Amino acid sequence: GCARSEGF
Amino acid sequence: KPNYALKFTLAGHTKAVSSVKFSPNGEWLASSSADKLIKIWGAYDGKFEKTISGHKLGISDVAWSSDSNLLVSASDDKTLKIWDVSSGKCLKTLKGHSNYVFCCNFNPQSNLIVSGSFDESVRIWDVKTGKCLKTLPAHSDPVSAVHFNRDGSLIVSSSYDGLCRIWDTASGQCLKTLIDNPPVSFVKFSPNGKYILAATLDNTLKLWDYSKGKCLKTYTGHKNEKYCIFANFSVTGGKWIVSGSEDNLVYIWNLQTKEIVQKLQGHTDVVISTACHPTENIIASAALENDKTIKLWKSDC
């Protein structure tokens, strides 16, 4: 995972 | 109206793609992924060229130097990395962010790198030495995008705190704050540097005049409520606004009239990233974990 693919 | 048609689908990332960028010489597409990898593909034939590795965690953003010879990547391992594209070797590891690095960009000279992080700061780095030159307490929430203007004298940043901010690069001082507070998920300068395109998480893109601080245009019809989705000015043919969308579509608007002129279908998950080729009417799009692929589209105008 990566912060962009996680979202919110 | 444009007529973008699918030409290539680029597979190989094993997790969600996070960002795609064309090299300034128009020859390459670079993609970063949650799979901790950067992949380099041919822009015109979609041919896989190489994989670049070394980050311990996923990568949220990637950017090219002006001469197309270097990449900078932003990663969850809290570092940025400067890579020689030709050799694929990591030239520098830029340490100092205390949380995930979300966004990165070279300045036009490409002696500087700007980064934004979940630690709510913006950092300015010397490319040659890897040292942090400045840390700007830019925001009160994670920084979603950072971008240099056409001469590199200005940096524009956006954040979940709802603010767009324009910083004087040389001094690090804030020159302007756009507040007119929905979370801002993406921001970038227009090619001439006079305008700023900002995405907010209320399914809205807005075109602002920087020097006047006025919203000139509003573009709607797409779904953008959760993810930081790239948007672009398309200038090679007609003047379009291009963006990914959470309904798995690529949206293309007429910039002046704000009307949707095309919707590209084919992705099976959120189109997190779109990029416009520097000279050809070519769009690259990239999607999240359920899709994992990049798509190249070509238009006659």
Numbering used by the authors:
A (entry chain B): 1745 to 1752
B (entry chain A): 32 to 211, 214 to 334
How do the authors describe this structure?
pmcWDR5, a well-established core scaffolding protein found in histone methyltransferase complexes MLL1-4 and SET1A/B, was initially characterized as an epigenetic histone “writer” to recognize histone H3 lysine 4 (H3K4) and is essential for H3K4 di- and tri-methylation (H3K4me2 and H3K4me3) to activate gene transcription. Two separate and non-overlapping sites located on opposite surfaces of WDR5 mediate most of its interactions with binding partners: an arginine-bearing cavity located on the surface known as the WDR5-interacting (WIN) site, and a shallow cleft on the opposite side referred to as the WDR5-binding (WBM) site. In mice, methyl-CpG binding domain 3 isoform C (MBD3C) interacts specifically with the histone H3 binding protein WD repeat-containing protein 5 (WDR5) and forms the WDR5-MBD3C/Norde complex. The residues Val31-Cys334 of WDR5 are visible and consist of seven WD40 repeats that form a seven-bladed β-propeller structure.
Structural analysis of various WIN motif-containing peptides bound to WDR5, we found that the WIN motif of SET1B (1745GCARSEGFYT1754) is the only one featuring an ′′Arg-X-X-X-Phe′′ pattern, as MBD3C does. To better understand the binding mechanism of WDR5-MBD3C, we set out to determine the crystal structure of the WIN motif of SET1B (residues 1745–1754) in complex with WDR5 at 2.40 Å resolution. Structural alignment revealed that SET1B interacts with WDR5 in a manner distinct from MBD3C, which is mainly located at the C-terminal region of peptides. In the structure of WDR5-SET1B, acidic residue Glu1750 is unable to form salt bridges with WDR5 Asp107, unlike MBD3C Arg45. Instead of forming hydrogen bonds with water molecules, the Glu1750 carbonyl is flipped in the opposite direction and generates a hydrogen bond with the ε-NH2 group of WDR5 Lys259. In comparison to water molecules in WDR5-MBD3C, two water molecules adjacent to WDR5 Cys261 in WDR5-SET1B move and generate a hydrogen bond network with WDR5 Tyr191, which is further stabilized by the hydrogen-bonding interaction of WDR5 Tyr191 with Cys261. The most significant structural difference lies in the ∼91° rotation of WDR5 Tyr191 from the MBD3C-bound state to SET1B-bound state. Consequently, the hydrophobic B site formed by the rotation of Tyr191 in WDR5 is closed in WDR5-SET1B, and the side chain of SET1B Phe1752 is oriented towards the solution, thus making minimal contribution to the interaction with WDR5. Although SET1B contains a similar ′′Arg-X-X-X-Phe ′′ motif, our data has confirmed that SET1B does not induce the formation of the WDR5 Tyr191-related B site. In contrast, in both the apo- and SET1B-bound forms of WDR5, Tyr191 undergoes a rotation towards Cys261, resulting in the closure of the pocket formed by the residues surrounding WDR5 Cys261.
